[PDB]
Amino acid sequence: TTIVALKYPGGVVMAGDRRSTQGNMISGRDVRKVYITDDYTATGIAGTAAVAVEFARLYAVELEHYEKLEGVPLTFAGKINRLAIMVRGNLAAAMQGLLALPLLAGYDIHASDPQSAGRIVSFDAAGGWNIEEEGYQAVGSGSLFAKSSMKKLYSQVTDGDSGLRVAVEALYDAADDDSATGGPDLVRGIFPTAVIIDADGAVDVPESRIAELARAIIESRS
Amino acid sequence: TTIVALKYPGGVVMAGDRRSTQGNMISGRDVRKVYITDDYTATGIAGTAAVAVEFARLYAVELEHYEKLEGVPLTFAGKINRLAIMVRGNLAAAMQGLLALPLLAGYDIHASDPQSAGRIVSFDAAGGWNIEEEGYQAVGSGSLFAKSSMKKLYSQVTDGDSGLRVAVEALYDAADDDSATGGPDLVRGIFPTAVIIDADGAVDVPESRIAELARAIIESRS
Amino acid sequence: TTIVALKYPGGVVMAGDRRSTQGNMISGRDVRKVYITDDYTATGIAGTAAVAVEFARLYAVELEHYEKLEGVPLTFAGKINRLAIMVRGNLAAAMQGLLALPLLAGYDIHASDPQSAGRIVSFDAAGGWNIEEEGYQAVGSGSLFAKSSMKKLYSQVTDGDSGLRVAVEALYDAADDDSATGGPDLVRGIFPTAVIIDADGAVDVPESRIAELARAIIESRSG
Amino acid sequence: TTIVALKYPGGVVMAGDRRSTQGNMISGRDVRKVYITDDYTATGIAGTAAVAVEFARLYAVELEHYEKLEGVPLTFAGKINRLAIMVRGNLAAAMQGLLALPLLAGYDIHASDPQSAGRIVSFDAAGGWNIEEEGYQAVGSGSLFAKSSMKKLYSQVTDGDSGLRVAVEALYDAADDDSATGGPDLVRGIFPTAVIIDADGAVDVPESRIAELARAIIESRS
Amino acid sequence: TTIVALKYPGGVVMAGDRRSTQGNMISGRDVRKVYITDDYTATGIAGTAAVAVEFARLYAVELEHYEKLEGVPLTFAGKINRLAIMVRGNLAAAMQGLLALPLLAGYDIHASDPQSAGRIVSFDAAGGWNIEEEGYQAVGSGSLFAKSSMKKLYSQVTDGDSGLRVAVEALYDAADDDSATGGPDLVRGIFPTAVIIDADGAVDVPESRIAELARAIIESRSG
Amino acid sequence: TTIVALKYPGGVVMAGDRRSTQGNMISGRDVRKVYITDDYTATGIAGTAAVAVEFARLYAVELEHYEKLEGVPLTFAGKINRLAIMVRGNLAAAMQGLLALPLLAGYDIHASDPQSAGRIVSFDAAGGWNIEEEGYQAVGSGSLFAKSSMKKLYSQVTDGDSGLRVAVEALYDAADDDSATGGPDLVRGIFPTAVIIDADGAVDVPESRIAELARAIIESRSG
Amino acid sequence: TTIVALKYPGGVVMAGDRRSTQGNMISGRDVRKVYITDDYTATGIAGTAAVAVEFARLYAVELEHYEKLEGVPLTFAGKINRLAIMVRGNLAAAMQGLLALPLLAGYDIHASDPQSAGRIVSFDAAGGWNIEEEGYQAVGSGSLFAKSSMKKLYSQVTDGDSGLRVAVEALYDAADDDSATGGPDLVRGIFPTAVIIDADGAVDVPESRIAELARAIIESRSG
């Protein structure tokens, strides 16, 4: 797997590949790893599939639960803390092979500067969290290739569309070097998934635009 | 890795993919896994790369050594036996992680019926060898996918071209279901390799013909 | 074992072999591995016989339990989640050898398009689930053979007859390459079991129809 | 450690960092890890220092040895083979923690096309060897970062000088993300070492040029 | 990691590096390891990032919890005891790999001599605690280089400014000899953090001040 | 560590070194290992620092807790038994490396002959206690050097001053032959600590007196 | 153990402590760990005493053997290589607990200018070797403290005499922080041993000069 998240002026973007493996064997081609966990938050998990899906579902439920009980959504800090506590809860099973690392991306409606209200948070198997203050981050077996690619491409990010394009390119490179990360499949028409978040909330990026960006990248490297 | 071999009327064809992994990481994209070990025999190996290459080189040198010392090539049974012995000798190292299994294709100039003078021989880690009588065979992490593909496609083989087609398509299904087997790279222009052997000997199938076949398959499945 | 399931226009079909082994020894020849778990869903399980039987029985009981307590049947998603939870619960035992993997085929009466209301769902030992969007799937020791077979035959599936044919042939290829999957036994008259599900519910396939299909496949492979 | 090597029109360049560690403790600041192993080849090793130095010294002795015994140097293929044999010979010790991997950069005086006479060969612990066709390569605890950096920077290589700059930058990104690879030390004035090889032979790149390049990179990233 | 702390006439200073690692890979560049845990104390922690952050957070919360429950803050000895107990509770996890050792700096308002009211306390994995009576201490993978450095520099501490400088130079030596401690980053403008505590309380040292001291130290080492 | 305790006419003296180590590394130069546990008893502990300090503190709290609850202090036998029970209760952790052995010195106000009212009780890891009838005892890694020294020097004890001297010399020999026991540090003016108990209770011995005794021993061995 | 060596303008100096241990027990007070292995080189070994002494003896014999056989002494690089090969050869015993690590200090009579002909080479258990270009190095249980001490004191090295002072003070700091390295023993009159090498060869430093320096260092730390 590879999940990528990067900040652009006024919002944030997260993308994920579609591949699922059992050792060397390909067990899935269209798995959706990026979830809209609330109006201003998207979560993307890598690792054991059962644990990842459970993480996304339970997490979303917990946030909305607090929102309905208290009539107000948690602060972003509280969201980070809840996610980390959940990851720490699974540490023993993670030692037994059921490991799942999430990557958090959101838009903080209470931050001071609305242009820099975008947020990207990494986690580790111990439940330690770190807010990324350098614009992008990745997680999964291709996360280093995606981070080194974004390190070079990030200067092209000036708005939503350029940020989305750099995210899809970083997923392209991750898949280029990591056999556990699926690239674009032109035969079947399956492309990475994406969520973008700004002042109006978190929305699913349409498949078509991601496909145009992918084909452009492909034709550019030929 | 996936290596395939199949018999067509009056000849045999062997083809292999180009991928090399270190776990999940792609360590090579243009590897050659099918070596012409002599004028009438080709060998394709799956497993530890350092071991497979040594297998091919040493095997070729042994067959030619016998030829030059005794003025005549080994009978096909002799070639089989020497390869089996070489594999058996590597069993200890193979248990300690350095495993490599070969597949042998050949054209027996001493067969009665030149129509079925093709030969396909498969091997196991303990030196066991079996002459395949059902037409085709495969070795490597994708070999089950490729064999089950050739089970459905083999009835279409009536000559070298259809055999090459079924071979490339079998490698395609392999890459499709196994991340350790590489599919055709249309961006970089890299395709599987193929050796074809008939009465005029063993010869390397040129890249452009395999590329044509691969593009046909890709266009058909869209 | 091999269980296969596949979608066809307006329905789903699932079939399973009849073999039971203790290592190399054959301990059963007529096992029923595919169960009608409710009016619109079948479950086929591969693994330790005892755990597979218990799974099917407890699962059917659970769905009907909810239905009677609440007056309405669970959504298909609910059914998935429930089977996955039950598999997750058995993980510790699975680590010690009491392993069972199910496969779920069903018709969703609440789907928008009635012709694509078929559903195929696969699971792993950790309770992960995936809704299969390529129309066919399989589980058990023969599942790779059966899947690579259906990968070539699936273009022939245009109705329930064709889908049943493809499914029986996939079980045949599985039995052909995997010794823990039993092929048709013409001497004893024992053939794989199968269920078909569509808008009118889920029905067992009479043994004689599977017999006809098995004889067709055999004679085809013969000449 | 990180060792990089890339091809440019008419030659090859190799560069390595200067860091030696004992776990977390920095035990070395000016280690030379890239050696001119003969008039047309340089080797750079990562891993256990004792083994690395042993490899460089002994390998050089073996090449020159053959040359004096036989009046002519080994073919590049022979050099590759000898280095792979050495590495395989160290495999048991490597299994016991005495691991060391070489990277080979050469210029083949017997190549047909003088522009594409550059050679880069990577190795694994089993003695497997692979000639790199895609232009660059690296080895060591930072090789992944350096390779992903060169993936984006390689299109700037048009002569020896731009290739050297790209190499030094790749080492810079390695040091950036990998604590076992040392960056430029402006306080002590210690910089990566580099060897450059073309038709006129292999020569050490003078430290001053690497200092200039490193400072250009540093200023650029400020 | 390297956390240092030292006493000067009238107060105490504590400073920490910014690096985060996962084996050899650098995973963090701006990590805050030194926290103001109450108006007159600062805890810095080395070890597993998760455990460290939870230690600082829970410790601060506990101190304020006592303060608000009983109307008065804990005695410094009480604070030491609470932190020691927290460290001891984590011992099993620590042996399992989730190790975290704190270092505690403080200014005791209830001490006899305000000029010597500064306090430095070090801890071990079993929860043992020692009040340092030689003026400086350090925790982490570069703590020994830091302490040996402060042994030679400490006679230059006569006030808060000299103390801050010596602390930053000790972290400099630590990063100089420890790949796991991060030295000043002049390209990104990231420097160690520091807290200073006197009778007016505990304040964060502004980044610009640490940057000035770092630049001065680096110029010194260059010439 | 080395703690020593010896009886003199009408009282008892206990003294301990000041060193703390982690393997070979010195982690403490001024550690106090001899605690006044009540007006008529001092305890000195060897082993893991955190356990030693916890023992001393908890034991004092227990003795005073009883004294306040029942209006009267425990008899000396009672104090022995509580210390022994505390030690036994730690035997599992001691098995896993949290090992700490105390050494008790006291003055039994209820004894008939005030000349022999001094008491010295040694313990082992399983809770065993033994009242020492021969007048001196020691505990720790230097304990054998200290006991063999006092075997030769004890006949010179006729009052508190000679007893104190012999205790300091015992510790001096211990430090001389045991690296985990700290000799006197004349560069820093740190010397072993001593508690003395007679009918007027237990008091800390001023550092000055121990210092003069130490210097007298050092010169007496310089020539 | 702690061995130090540093370059001074015109030569090199090596100094070694005198302690021997068996666990915490001090087994030796007068060990000589720094050997004149030939006219221009000294070797100081840390580790198992039998292995270290064997190393010094056999290495000296080997050098002189070559010298008498070929009429000319080995190049300094050759000396390095022979020592490294010896260490590498003992690696297996070293892993069974018979570990010994040498430090080599020499004067290369073939260097261009004689003011920088000093050489300091360190080694590891695998036979790796490194010519130190920063002026100083130490090996042993106290080498970290000694190195971080010389890091600060090395600017004071301007000739052989100041070199010896800094070497002895590095050893003093090592003994201050490491119980396995022995400090100066003023009662018994035992001090570290030292060799100095210049163009006139290698010479043992007379005990009286080492004692002078030691007393100066002590009377400086104390006041």
Ligand SMILES: Cc1cc(C(=O)N[C@@H](CC(=O)N2CCC[C@@H]2c2ccccc2)C(=O)N[C@@H](C)C(=O)NCc2ccc(F)cc2F)no1
């Ligand atoms: C224990 C244990 C582990 C596994 C295992 O490896 N299970 C695989 C998954 C798998 O084979 N099956 C088959 C049936 C359903 C389940 C699936 C669920 C969802 C999607 C695709 C498949 C896995 O977890 N593989 C890992 C390596 C993986 O590919 N993870 C990708 C992933 C990331 C995030 C996410 F939300 C979902 C994902 F699948 N099985 O038992």
Ligand SMILES: Cc1cc(C(=O)N[C@@H](CC(=O)N2CCC[C@@H]2c2ccccc2)C(=O)N[C@@H](C)C(=O)NCc2ccc(F)cc2F)no1
């Ligand atoms: C022990 C040990 C094993 C390995 C290891 O995993 N070594 C990898 C190979 C690898 O990373 N490198 C990098 C430098 C050279 C070597 C390479 C050689 C030839 C071609 C491409 C690369 C492997 O053996 N991977 C296996 C799983 C593989 O991919 N094998 C494919 C293969 C089959 C036949 C053949 F002839 C060549 C092949 F690469 N390393 O140490």
Ligand SMILES: Cc1cc(C(=O)N[C@@H](CC(=O)N2CCC[C@@H]2c2ccccc2)C(=O)N[C@@H](C)C(=O)NCc2ccc(F)cc2F)no1
């Ligand atoms: C522990 C342990 C496991 C076993 C074991 O391997 N027990 C065998 C089964 C077996 O020998 N006997 C004999 C009498 C009853 C029992 C049976 C039950 C039901 C049906 C046919 C037989 C098994 O579990 N074999 C596995 C490998 C198998 O063949 N499983 C096929 C299967 C799948 C699903 C299902 F519902 C029923 C099945 F038999 N014994 O102890």
Ligand SMILES: Cc1cc(C(=O)N[C@@H](CC(=O)N2CCC[C@@H]2c2ccccc2)C(=O)N[C@@H](C)C(=O)NCc2ccc(F)cc2F)no1
């Ligand atoms: C067994 C065993 C292993 C080690 C060990 O970790 N030994 C370290 C090296 C080390 O501490 N010392 C100190 C004295 C000489 C030796 C050194 C050699 C050469 C240069 C600088 C120092 C190592 O090998 N570390 C590895 C991880 C390393 O840093 N490798 C970088 C490197 C690559 C190629 C090369 F030629 C030289 C190198 F140092 N020691 O015993």
Ligand SMILES: Cc1cc(C(=O)N[C@@H](CC(=O)N2CCC[C@@H]2c2ccccc2)C(=O)N[C@@H](C)C(=O)NCc2ccc(F)cc2F)no1
């Ligand atoms: C089990 C297990 C261990 C680890 C692990 O090694 N986790 C690393 C930390 C890490 O890679 N990540 C990535 C995202 C979150 C987490 C992070 C949190 C906060 C700040 C920066 C990062 C660690 O713990 N490394 C240790 C060795 C370390 O670097 N410790 C320095 C440190 C000290 C105090 C402190 F408060 C925070 C620190 F990072 N993960 O699972």
Ligand SMILES: Cc1cc(C(=O)N[C@@H](CC(=O)N2CCC[C@@H]2c2ccccc2)C(=O)N[C@@H](C)C(=O)NCc2ccc(F)cc2F)no1
């Ligand atoms: C598990 C585990 C063990 C240790 C460990 O060995 N911890 C050391 C002590 C140590 O390094 N530190 C560092 C700061 C706090 C703590 C300290 C506490 C109190 C006084 C001085 C230091 C120890 O216990 N060493 C033992 C071998 C020792 O020297 N014990 C002497 C001693 C006896 C009685 C007593 F009351 C205090 C003592 F220090 N740590 O985690």
Ligand SMILES: Cc1cc(C(=O)N[C@@H](CC(=O)N2CCC[C@@H]2c2ccccc2)C(=O)N[C@@H](C)C(=O)NCc2ccc(F)cc2F)no1
């Ligand atoms: C196995 C095994 C190990 C040991 C062991 O611990 N052997 C001790 C040495 C020891 O107790 N004795 C007593 C009589 C002779 C022998 C001695 C030799 C020479 C000088 C002084 C004593 C050691 O090796 N201790 C180590 C930890 C040590 O202290 N090493 C310091 C040292 C370095 C270099 C050198 F040349 C001599 C030294 F003593 N014995 O068997």
